[PDB]
């Protein structure tokens, strides 16, 4: 009856190859094979003939993971074949994968560990490919336990084997490789890490088809920003003005040999033998910048060349996260001008101010309880108006001859102070300012205390020229400082940052004394 059996197989196969499209006469094949079971009659040969449908049977009873009967039959057959060549790995993987959602992850590990062990012990689609699925499923397990080093080894090794075959897809290459980047960023191995991102550019070059560029452009940002900010080792303000006192040593013989060993591992990724080499050629042409002392145009061009797709992502964001990239570009452009160590230009400050107006209108659009968005914007208000403070210091020191009208700039400073007091008065009204939002005590002390310290410095910045105003501001500063004394020394939370506490202790003595001085002026006036 073997011809009949084979015909029944091949007849059943196609319908399997498809309200659920199946389980439908998939029991008729069951009935026929089980009819074959009884008068099956060596014995091992007969048994081998069996487990095929049984495999499929367990496969059939998925029932969208709400079942169990398939589980039972599968484990039965697995015990059979255990006592009884690639079938074991073909099954054990899927048996485990359900328990993965059952979250017995540690136990599930042992299965895949055994599978790879069997691979290693042993030494056409299965022969050239099932290795793949185990490796892929392996990495996402590690994420929770955070051996990212170990996971990276697999992911990187997996991509190489993936290159043997013609299977390639843009998401599976890009969205994986790009995310792999940040790992080395933390390890600060830029010289090694460039290659991944840089090579990630041609595969995608050969819906999502548009929005995938977003992560691509984002990863560029983190590359630049760390490289600039690491240079902040030596600040002209707190470190000697002479720079590069120690030998620059841009090119070192000892360093290159060590690099080559790492480079050799990187070299292994290239395959295609020449087109990938040309890809890496263009790679290096833009790797053209490593470690600079003339950096200015190079880094600005970094931004600009990626500013293109920065804008593109802004297009591909619906008004919600556009602010995020806008303010990131804001900060970075500011940092370019800053670390570009020269005085006379305020242009990027002014342009940031315009962009800041631009991001302020959404407050009118959205008066939602966007607390920390408001906190953030007030923070860069502090920062920009500190830029005002410092440029004021610079101009005032630059006052060689008689001062022209910079009192307009001083009033700009005053309205900056007004904007600030509006912001921390928003914070007030949140706390004690209004009928809708009053509070018992300043129970929340830490973050508003650091904000209040900033405004303390601002009150110290009340130093202006006006005569009837000076007197009332003497009183205002004294009273504000006394408020602050109450806020901290007498709240008795004692969880307040003691470093600050002592800073405002210095400030409180520094306030006691010239309040006495102002008394002296007033009473010399009383004389």
From Swiss-Prot:
InterPro entries: KBP, TPR-like_helical_dom_sf. Gene3D superfamilies: Tetratricopeptide repeat domain (1.25.40.10). GO terms for molecular function: kinesin binding; protein sequestering activity. It is found in: Cytoplasm, Cytoskeleton. Keywords: Cytoplasm, Cytoskeleton, Developmental protein, Differentiation, Hirschsprung disease, Neurogenesis, Phosphoprotein. Highly expressed in heart, brain, ovary, testis, spinal cord and all specific brain regions examined. Moderate expressed at intermediate level in all other adult tissues examined, as well as in fetal liver and brain. Not expressed in blood leukocytes. GO terms for biological process: central nervous system projection neuron axonogenesis; in utero embryonic development; microtubule cytoskeleton organization; mitochondrion transport along microtubule; neuron projection maintenance; transport along microtubule. Its main location: cytoplasm. GO terms for cellular component: cytoskeleton; mitochondrion. It is linked to Goldberg-Shprintzen syndrome: A disorder characterized by intellectual disability, microcephaly, and dysmorphic facial features. Most patients also have Hirschsprung disease. Activator of KIF1B plus-end-directed microtubule motor activity. Required for organization of axonal microtubules, and axonal outgrowth and maintenance during peripheral and central nervous system development. PANTHER family: KIF-BINDING PROTEIN, KIF1-BINDING PROTEIN. Interacts with KIF1B; positively regulates KIF1B microtubule motor activity. Interacts with STMN2. Belongs to the KIF-binding protein family. This is KIF-binding protein.
């Amino acid at each position: 009856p073997w011809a009949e059996v084979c015909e029944k197989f091949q007849a059943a196969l196609a319908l399997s190859r498809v309200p659920y499209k199946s389980k439908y006469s998939a029991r008729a094949l069951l009935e026929e094979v089980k009819a074959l079971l009884g008068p099956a009659p060596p014995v091992a040969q007969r048994a081998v003939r069996l487990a095929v449908i049984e495999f499929h049977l367990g496969v059939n009873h998925i029932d969208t993971e709400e079942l169990s009967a398939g589980e039972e039959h599968l484990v039965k057959c697995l015990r059979l074949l255990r006592r009884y060549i690639s079938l074991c790995i073909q099954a054990q993987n899927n048996l485990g994968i359900l328990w993965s959602e059952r979250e017995e992850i540690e136990t599930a590990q042992a299965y895949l560990e055994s599978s790879e062990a069997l691979y290693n012990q042993y030494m056409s689609k299965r022969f050239e490919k099932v290795y793949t699925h185990n490796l892929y499923y392996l990495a996402q397990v590690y994420q929770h336990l955070e051996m990212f080093e170990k996971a990276a080894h697999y992911c990187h090794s997996t991509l190489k084997r993936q290159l043997e075959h013609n299977a390639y897809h843009p998401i599976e290459w890009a969205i994986n490789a790009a995310t792999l980047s940040q790992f080395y960023i933390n390890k600060l191995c830029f010289m090694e890490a460039r290659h991944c991102l840089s090579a990630a550019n041609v595969i995608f070059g050969q819906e999502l088809y548009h929005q995938r560029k977003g992560e691509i452009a984002r990863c560029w940002i983190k590359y630049c920003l760390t490289l600039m900010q690491n240079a902040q080792l030596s600040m002209q303000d707190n470190i000697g003005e002479l720079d590069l006192d120690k030998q620059s040593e841009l090119r070192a013989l000892r360093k290159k040999e060590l690099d080559e060993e790492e480079s050799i591992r990187k070299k292994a990724v290239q395959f295609g033998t020449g087109e990938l080499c040309d890809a890496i050629s263009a790679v290096e042409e833009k790797v053209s910048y490593l470690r600079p002392l003339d950096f200015e145009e190079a880094r600005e061009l970094f931004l600009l060349g990626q500013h293109y797709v920065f804008e593109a992502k802004e297009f591909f964001q619906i008004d919600g996260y556009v602010t995020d990239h806008i303010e990131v570009v804001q900060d970075h452009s500011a940092l370019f001008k800053v670390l570009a160590f020269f005085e006379t230009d305020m242009e990027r400050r002014c342009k940031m101010h315009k962009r800041r107006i631009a991001m302020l209108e959404p407050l009118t659009v959205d008066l939602n309880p966007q607390y920390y968005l408001l906190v953030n914007r007030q923070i860069q208000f502090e920062i920009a108006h500190a830029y005002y403070d410092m440029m004021d210091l610079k101009v005032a020191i630059a006052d060689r001859l008689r001062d022209p009208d910079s009192h307009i700039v001083k009033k700009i400073n005053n309205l900056n102070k007004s904007a600030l007091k509006y912001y921390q008065l928003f914070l007030d009204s949140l706390r004690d300012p209004n009928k809708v939002f009053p509070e018992h005590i300043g129970e929340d002390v830490l973050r508003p205390a650091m904000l209040a310290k900033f405004r303390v410095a601002r009150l110290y910045g009340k130093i202006i020229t006006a005569d009837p105003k000076k007197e009332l501001e003497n009183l205002a500063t004294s009273l504000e400082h006394y408020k602050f004394i109450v806020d901290y020394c007498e709240k008795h939370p004692e969880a307040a940052q003691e470093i600050e506490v002592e800073l405002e202790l210095s400030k409180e003595m520094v306030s006691l004394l010239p309040t006495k001085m102002e008394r002296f002026r007033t009473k010399m006036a009383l004389t």
